[PDB]
Amino acid sequence: ATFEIVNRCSYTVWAAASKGDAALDAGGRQLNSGESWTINVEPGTNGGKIWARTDCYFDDSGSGICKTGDCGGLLRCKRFGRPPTTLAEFSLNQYGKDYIDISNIKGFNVPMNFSPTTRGCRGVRCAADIVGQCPAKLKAPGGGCNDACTVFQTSEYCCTTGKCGPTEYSRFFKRLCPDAFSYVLDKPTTVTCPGSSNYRVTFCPTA
């Protein structure tokens, strides 16, 4: 599948794409304002994620730090990133269908649009000003708005028992972006698309 990653933000992001134990395509790249990066995602990939990282510094060997979404200090991510990170999530060619979602379960850093470019399903978006409205306890000094699992490390926020309900914190993310996961057992906002669809992820889709 082909994913075109678009940075429409006014600031530079460092895009990332990994399936947790490996990179997708090169794994990461700088995207200045307006740049587009096109990657290929091997068919059948299940549990892939794409995110933005902000405020990064990398040396000439691709080693460094980002303030949000750092993946162990590497430009080219192998693993998932440190919260807060707004996530686009996908599983490809699963019994003939592709599965796509946006999640705030690991917090929010950059607004995002995840839209099929091919025919047969709809996109989803989380575009609100979550960082500006973030409750003070969930604010990340680095930037972003953490999820309450990250911050408070409880069974209820982390949904450790497989039974958990919505919270004052989940409902905050849900009120601002109903079309994204807000906690692990939220009613699904997964979109089912035709198998072997191609995609666009747009950072800061509205500004």
UniProtKB/Swiss-Prot annotation:
Pfam families, per the entry: Thaumatin
Lipid biosynthesis as UniProt keyword: no
Disulfide bonds: C9-C204, C56-C66, C71-C77, C121-C193, C126-C177, C134-C145, C149-C158, C159-C164
InterPro entries: Osmotin/thaumatin-like_sf (IPR037176), Thaumatin (IPR001938), Thaumatin_CS (IPR017949)
Cellular compartment(s): Cytoplasmic vesicle
PROSITE patterns: THAUMATIN_1, THAUMATIN_2
Gene3D superfamilies tied to this protein: Thaumatin (2.60.110.10)
Domain of life according to the entry: Eukaryota
Cellular component, GO annotation: cytoplasmic vesicle
Keywords on record: Cytoplasmic vesicle, Disulfide bond, Signal, Taste-modifying protein
PANTHER family in the record: OS03G0233200 PROTEIN
Function, in words: Taste-modifying protein; intensely sweet-tasting. It is 100000 times sweeter than sucrose on a molar basis.
Family (UniProt): Belongs to the thaumatin family.
Protein name, UniProt field: Thaumatin I
